[PDB]
Design an enzyme around this catalytic site. Structure first.
Site, mmCIF file in Angstrom:
data_model
loop_
_atom_site.group_PDB
_atom_site.id
_atom_site.type_symbol
_atom_site.label_atom_id
_atom_site.label_comp_id
_atom_site.label_asym_id
_atom_site.label_seq_id
_atom_site.Cartn_x
_atom_site.Cartn_y
_atom_site.Cartn_z
ATOM 1 N N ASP A 201 0.794 -1.226 0.000
ATOM 2 C CA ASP A 201 0.000 0.000 0.000
ATOM 3 C C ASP A 201 0.830 1.282 0.000
ATOM 4 O O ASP A 201 0.505 2.244 0.696
ATOM 5 C CB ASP A 201 -1.015 -0.002 1.158
ATOM 6 C CG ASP A 201 -2.149 0.998 0.992
ATOM 7 O OD1 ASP A 201 -2.312 1.540 -0.144
ATOM 8 O OD2 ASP A 201 -2.849 1.265 1.986
ATOM 9 N N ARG B 43 0.171 9.302 0.421
ATOM 10 C CA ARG B 43 -0.534 9.422 1.696
ATOM 11 C C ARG B 43 0.137 8.532 2.758
ATOM 12 O O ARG B 43 0.042 8.855 3.929
ATOM 13 C CB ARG B 43 -2.035 9.080 1.546
ATOM 14 C CG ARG B 43 -2.309 7.625 1.211
ATOM 15 C CD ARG B 43 -3.765 7.275 0.869
ATOM 16 N NE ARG B 43 -3.854 5.836 0.656
ATOM 17 C CZ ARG B 43 -3.864 5.248 -0.535
ATOM 18 N NH1 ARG B 43 -3.897 5.983 -1.652
ATOM 19 N NH2 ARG B 43 -3.873 3.922 -0.626
ATOM 20 N N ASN B 44 0.863 7.445 2.365
ATOM 21 C CA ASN B 44 1.576 6.580 3.330
ATOM 22 C C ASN B 44 3.060 6.916 3.489
ATOM 23 O O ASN B 44 3.802 6.165 4.117
ATOM 24 C CB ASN B 44 1.386 5.092 3.042
ATOM 25 C CG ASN B 44 0.033 4.568 3.460
ATOM 26 O OD1 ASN B 44 -0.570 3.738 2.771
ATOM 27 N ND2 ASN B 44 -0.507 5.063 4.554
ATOM 28 N N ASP C 15 2.598 2.406 7.731
ATOM 29 C CA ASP C 15 1.579 1.404 7.498
ATOM 30 C C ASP C 15 2.085 0.127 6.867
ATOM 31 O O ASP C 15 1.328 -0.538 6.166
ATOM 32 C CB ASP C 15 0.433 2.000 6.696
ATOM 33 C CG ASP C 15 -0.486 2.863 7.528
ATOM 34 O OD1 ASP C 15 -0.519 2.678 8.750
ATOM 35 O OD2 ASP C 15 -1.183 3.722 6.947
HETATM 36 C C1 LIG Z 1 -1.804 12.430 5.173
HETATM 37 C C2 LIG Z 1 -2.612 11.178 5.074
HETATM 38 C C3 LIG Z 1 -3.210 10.793 6.398
HETATM 39 O O1 LIG Z 1 -3.919 11.570 7.005
HETATM 40 N N1 LIG Z 1 -2.945 9.562 6.870
HETATM 41 C C4 LIG Z 1 -3.811 8.903 7.853
HETATM 42 C C5 LIG Z 1 -3.494 7.431 7.650
HETATM 43 C C6 LIG Z 1 -1.981 7.468 7.395
HETATM 44 N N2 LIG Z 1 -1.245 7.653 8.693
HETATM 45 C C7 LIG Z 1 -0.660 8.779 9.154
HETATM 46 C C8 LIG Z 1 -0.160 8.486 10.397
HETATM 47 C C9 LIG Z 1 0.691 9.381 11.220
HETATM 48 C C10 LIG Z 1 0.478 10.750 11.243
HETATM 49 C C11 LIG Z 1 1.280 11.534 12.043
HETATM 50 N N3 LIG Z 1 2.281 11.058 12.786
HETATM 51 C C12 LIG Z 1 2.518 9.747 12.705
HETATM 52 C C13 LIG Z 1 1.740 8.873 11.977
HETATM 53 C C14 LIG Z 1 -0.486 7.109 10.600
HETATM 54 C C15 LIG Z 1 -0.243 6.234 11.763
HETATM 55 C C16 LIG Z 1 -0.577 6.644 13.049
HETATM 56 C C17 LIG Z 1 -0.371 5.804 14.127
HETATM 57 C C18 LIG Z 1 0.108 4.519 13.931
HETATM 58 C C19 LIG Z 1 0.428 4.103 12.646
HETATM 59 O O2 LIG Z 1 1.030 2.872 12.506
HETATM 60 C C20 LIG Z 1 1.501 2.464 11.203
HETATM 61 C C21 LIG Z 1 2.279 1.172 11.245
HETATM 62 C C22 LIG Z 1 3.672 1.143 11.169
HETATM 63 C C23 LIG Z 1 4.369 -0.062 11.154
HETATM 64 C C24 LIG Z 1 3.665 -1.269 11.186
HETATM 65 C C25 LIG Z 1 2.281 -1.254 11.240
HETATM 66 C C26 LIG Z 1 1.598 -0.042 11.240
HETATM 67 C C27 LIG Z 1 1.765 -2.662 11.265
HETATM 68 N N4 LIG Z 1 2.993 -3.448 11.169
HETATM 69 C C28 LIG Z 1 3.011 -4.903 11.125
HETATM 70 C C29 LIG Z 1 4.122 -2.683 11.154
HETATM 71 O O3 LIG Z 1 5.260 -3.123 11.100
HETATM 72 C C30 LIG Z 1 0.257 4.950 11.562
HETATM 73 N N5 LIG Z 1 -1.179 6.618 9.580
HETATM 74 C C31 LIG Z 1 -1.844 8.684 6.484
#
Ligand SMILES: *CCC(=O)N1CC[C@H](n2cc(-c3ccncc3)c(-c3cccc(OCc4ccc5c(c4)CN(C)C5=O)c3)n2)C1
Length: 279
Positions: A132, A136-137, A150
């Site tokens: 993905d 945006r990611n 993500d």
């Molecule tokens: C600009 C686009 C937007 O608004 N988004 C929302 C969804 C995505 N996004 C942004 C953020 C973020 C924003 C600000 N500071 C930090 C992060 C996140 C987010 C938030 C909290 C936790 C998240 O975890 C992602 C993640 C990372 C590593 C792993 C996994 C998940 C699962 N996995 C097995 C891993 O190794 C992400 N999301 C953009």
């Protein structure tokens, strides 16, 4: 796995296909301080088995650090899971390029391409597929440092206009289909955040790709940059570039940026650059 009582959601930052992202505060037990964190609360309830899968997959990806890949720092096992990562104050690179549409130089656009390719190549070296990748990611730590977020959420928990044809037709995901999404990610950067295939329904995308139709050349791109994007969208996955080839290619372009991108007023902060590094 941390106690829910230690995390407080304070502001919405955005949302994705799996959840809502908040700027949160961490209050360690026994403490009175509030440490800012990013919390993503998943929309759908999840099984303890699926929670263990998320944690295990995160533990393997985060065994070694990579400067261009966000790691999962913690999890709160509530009604719906809350994923915790480092807060990126600049938000996502998609929103950043739209906001700085009149102030982004070729040097920054080309460096972000190298950084995303480096983060993607790290996943390929570990034999991990993102599934993905989109602008945006890609999150902005500082304007000079971007990181992919993500990782693995797609597989564990549909963006047709970012997917390789084999993924649309057969749900086949490989390092080479991530390369296709990388091409689309570059196209979003080079058009300052345009929506790919704007006005074309998702149901017509596979047939459009089958006829030979691809995303058009962004006005700022020389043919050399557009050709790299086009090669990312070859029907034959093995004909697409490798992330290490993309790293080399964009790094060469970044060393002489005005030869590869033509941006209005490109020729026109040193103290802020220095402070970002020190901080
Ligand atoms: C600009 C686009 C937007 O608004 N988004 C929302 C969804 C995505 N996004 C942004 C953020 C973020 C924003 C600000 N500071 C930090 C992060 C996140 C987010 C938030 C909290 C936790 C998240 O975890 C992602 C993640 C990372 C590593 C792993 C996994 C998940 C699962 N996995 C097995 C891993 O190794 C992400 N999301 C953009």
């Amino acid at each position: 796995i941390l106690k829910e009582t230690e995390f407080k959601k304070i502001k919405v930052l955005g949302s994705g296909a799996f959840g809502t992202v908040y700027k949160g505060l961490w209050i360690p037990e026994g403490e009175k301080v509030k440490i800012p964190v990013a919390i993503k609360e998943l929309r759908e309830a999840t099984s303890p088995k699926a929670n263990k899968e998320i944690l295990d997959e995160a533990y393997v990806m985060a065994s070694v650090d990579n400067p261009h890949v966000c790691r999962l720092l913690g999890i709160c096992l509530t009604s719906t899971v809350q994923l915790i990562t480092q807060l990126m104050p600049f938000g996502c690179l998609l929103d950043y390029v739209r906001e700085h549409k009149d102030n982004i130089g070729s040097q920054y656009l080309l460096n972000w391409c190298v950084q995303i390719a480096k983060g993607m190549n790290y996943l390929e070296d570990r034999r991990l597929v993102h599934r993905d990748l989109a602008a945006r990611n890609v999150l902005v730590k500082t304007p000079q440092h971007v990181k992919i977020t993500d990782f693995g959420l797609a597989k564990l928990l549909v963006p047709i206009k970012w997917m390789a044809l084999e993924s649309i037709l057969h749900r086949i995901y490989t390092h080479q289909s991530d390369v296709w999404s990388y091409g689309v990610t570059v196209w979003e950067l080079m058009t300052f955040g345009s929506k790919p295939y704007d006005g074309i329904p998702a149901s017509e995308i596979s047939s459009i790709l089958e006829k030979g139709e691809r995303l058009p050349q962004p006005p700022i791109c020389t043919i050399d940059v557009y050709m790299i994007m086009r090669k990312c969208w070859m029907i034959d996955a093995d004909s697409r570039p490798k992330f290490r080839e993309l790293i080399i290619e964009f790094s060469k372009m970044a060393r002489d940026p005005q030869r590869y991108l033509v941006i209005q007023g490109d020729e026109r902060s040193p103290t802020d650059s220095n402070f970002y590094r020190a901080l």
